[PDB]
Write a protein that binds this ligand. Structure first.
Ligand SMILES: Cc1nc2ccccc2c(-c2ccc3c(c2)CCCO3)c1[C@H](OC(C)(C)C)C(=O)O
Ligand SMILES: Cc1nc2ccccc2c(-c2ccc3c(c2)CCCO3)c1[C@H](OC(C)(C)C)C(=O)O
Lengths: 142, 142
């Protein structure tokens, strides 16, 4: 799968909104709890994501997520295109969030604990998602 | 320089607070505009950072940044130690922020544009910071 492809969705938990990005090739995730499910929050999240990784295309399971002018501006500026030509991790990450939830006060804190647990887990049968993304991208540079 | 070492500081711009993390070995940056210069914001930022990269030690130019129990809890949970045994990028990133500032409404938007510009720049004399971090970490896995 192309190293430049990401998937972005929002899930809902405890009346809050979790924006989840998945690097499709590796299974690596990054997430944030956002104060509203809005184009502006999506646009801002995409700018951060694009500054870190070489983001070429983004897919989502809710196409209307990407109609706002604010999202279109962020994909224009960062040189991102929509991927139409294509988990849920939102289940497995939700599973981890449930497992750690009582260990933190704020949902956002549990989310980041779950991201960390997910990305560091050896998928032995055996590198972790965090190891795979770095390998996939580094290899693609060369 | 060790691949696990990061530097974290806050700068101030327009009465807001910018938390800046630098991966010392590569020059890669990540940043966020935070609503207050507080231990809780620092702790939360460290949890996100640690879920993405293999963070072993963190340095800062203001040691009192790391005294709060909330920061100590985040370094405990994520397995991070303080680096005492050690730019400013906060100048060069501030320079880029100034260069793009009028192109965005919100300071936070300009910050992320400046992060993106910084990380993608070929340092030809020639890989970018974003390319170096991924190479440094991938190589260290192997
Ligand atoms: C509100 C809060 N108050 C505290 C008071 C004293 C000590 C720790 C905390 C923590 C905390 C910090 C790191 C951490 C975990 C919890 C749980 C394990 C991972 O590391 C939080 C957390 O909130 C912030 C992260 C925003 C500070 C939380 O939601 O519980
Ligand atoms: C508030 C705001 N309103 C808009 C209305 C219409 C079109 C775009 C925007 C943008 C925007 C989006 C992406 C982007 C840039 C600006 C500037 C170039 C990089 O990409 C913003 C920005 O704010 C958010 C990012 C939170 C939406 C901003 O601060 O200007």
């Amino acid at each position: 799968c192309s190293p430049g492809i990401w998937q972005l969705d929002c899930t809902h938990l405890e009346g809050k909104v979790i924006l989840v990005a998945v690097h499709v090739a590796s299974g690596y995730i990054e997430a944030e709890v956002i104060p509203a499910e809005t184009g502006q929050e999506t646009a801002y999240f995409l700018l951060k994501l694009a500054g870190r990784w070489p983001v070429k295309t983004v897919h989502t399971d809710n196409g209307s997520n990407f109609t706002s002018t604010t999202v279109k501006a962020a994909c224009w500026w960062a040189g991102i295109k929509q991927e139409f030509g294509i988990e849920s991790m939102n289940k497995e990450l939700k599973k981890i969030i449930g497992q750690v939830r009582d260990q933190a006060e704020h949902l956002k804190t549990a989310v980041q604990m779950a991201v960390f647990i997910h990305n560091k887990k050896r998928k032995g049968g055996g590198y972790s998602a965090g190891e795979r993304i770095v390998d996939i991208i580094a290899t693609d540079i060369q």
